[PDB]
Amino acid sequence: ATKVVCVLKGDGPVQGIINFEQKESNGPVKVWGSIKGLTEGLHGFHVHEFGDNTAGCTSAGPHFNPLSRKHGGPKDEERHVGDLGNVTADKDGVADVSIEDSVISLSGDHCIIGRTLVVHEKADDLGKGGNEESTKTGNAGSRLACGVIGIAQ
Amino acid sequence: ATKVVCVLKGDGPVQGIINFEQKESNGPVKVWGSIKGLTEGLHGFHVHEFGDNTAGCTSAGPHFNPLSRKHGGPKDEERHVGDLGNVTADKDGVADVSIEDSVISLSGDHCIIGRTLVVHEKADDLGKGGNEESTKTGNAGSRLACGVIGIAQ
Ligand SMILES: O=C(Nc1ccccc1)c1ccccc1[SeH]
Ligand SMILES: O=C(Nc1ccccc1)c1ccccc1[SeH]
Ligand SMILES: [Zn+2]
Ligand SMILES: [Zn+2]
């Protein structure tokens, strides 16, 4: 019943449209849409803390982390609320996105409305890279495109 | 205290940053920042319903209007929640924005988080233009720049 949407833009050629939908407050969020202009393979896919694009995607701050946990894959107990893991771009540079997540929400204290969705330069190592940056960002590199997560029709 | 922010971008040169601060729930909201690339004079300045940028500023929908009223100035009893009236571009094309509104909120029913701020091509006539368009849009014309209203540090 709660419908939200995010348009991903950055300096470069990466852009996309991601829909979010949640039927029950406590229940899962379906995340789906398309992203084009990516390099083929995995790209880190995260909700960042701030709906702030004042200095581009950098202003968005870290992965949304209300419970002060270390970075992980979406399936781990130890993760950021914003840890949606990876999306996969085909050879034409298009990632078809379809995720269900039960840690993000479109209501309550884990609500992601007014926060930033970011698609990253390279693979999220899901906290398994064996360095400090692995358990903070997943070493997914720079922020290619982002947008503020907003209420849709 | 809640702090939110909006970056205004469009197809032309209008660019700006607008901060929103509310110290207590259903308290007044301070709106302040800077917009540049505006023609000298009054520009309609409204929160629109949808934080949806899929089709540029057009997909923002109409003025945020949860109480199903007609368009007016921010000081009118008959207004949209999104009716913030006008901002003034000086002779350099810069609008230094500073508004206090008690109808918009950053919590509860009148909350503008995940909605869209739009600066318009022309003056908001505050519903006194003597036509249908006046009682819906204030004849503010086209959407020069918009942004989704997001959570700030
Ligand atoms: O809904 C929100 N909070 C909220 C907090 C506690 C209980 C119920 C609801 C919210 C606040 C800001 C932005 C977006 C949302 Se969804
Ligand atoms: O505030 C929100 N929910 C909410 C829930 C319970 C009490 C008060 C408020 C909210 C939801 C979506 C967007 C923005 C806000 Se501010
Ligand atoms: Zn993380
Ligand atoms: Zn209006």
Author numbering:
A (entry chain A), B (entry chain C): 1 to 153
Sentences from the paper on this structure:
Moreover, we demonstrate that ebselen and a number of its analogues form a covalent bond with Cys111 of A4V SOD1 using x-ray crystallography. In this study, we successfully co-crystallised A4V SOD1 on wild-type background (no C6S mutation) with various compounds in C2 space group and provide direct visualisation of the binding of ebselen, compounds 1, 4 and 6 at Cys111. The binding poses of ebselen, compounds 1 and 6 observed in A4V SOD1 structures are similar in that the seleno-head group covalently binds at Cys111 and the aromatic tail extends into the surrounding solvent beyond the dimer groove. Water-bridging hydrogen bonds were observed in A4V-ebselen and A4V-compound 1 structures, indirectly connecting carbonyl group or aromatic ring of the ligands with Gly108 backbone or Asp109 side chain. The phenyl ring of ebselen also links with the peptide backbone of Gly108 and Asp109 through an amide-π interaction, which is also observed in our previous crystal structure of wild-type SOD1 conjugated with ebselen. Although the covalent bond is the main interaction connecting the ligand and the protein, two ligands facing each other at the dimer interface are primarily linked by π-π stacking at aromatic rings. This stacking interaction might play an important role in stabilising the dimer. Conversely, A4VC6S-ebselen shows a strong band equivalent to disulphide reduced and unmodified SOD1 thus indicating Cys111 is extensively protected by ebselen binding. The crystal structures of ligand-bound A4V mutant and wild-type SOD113 agree with the thermal shift study that the compounds form a covalent bond with the sulphur atom of Cys111 of each monomer and the aromatic rings are in the position which promotes face-to-face π–π stacking interaction.
SOD1 is a homodimeric copper-containing and zinc-containing enzyme, serving as one of the cellular protective mechanisms against reactive oxygen species. An alanine-to-valine mutation at amino acid position 4 within the SOD1 protein (A4V), accounting for 50% of SOD1-related gene mutations in the US, causes a rapid and aggressive form of fALS, thereby reducing survival time to less than 2 years. While the mechanism of dimer destabilisation and the increased propensity to aggregate remain elusive, several structural and molecular dynamics studies have demonstrated that the A4V mutation causes structural changes in neighbouring residues close to the dimer interface, which potentially perturb overall dimer stability even though the interface interactions are generally conserved in the crystal structure. On the other hand, several studies have shown that Cys111 could be a potential target for the development of compounds to stabilise SOD1.
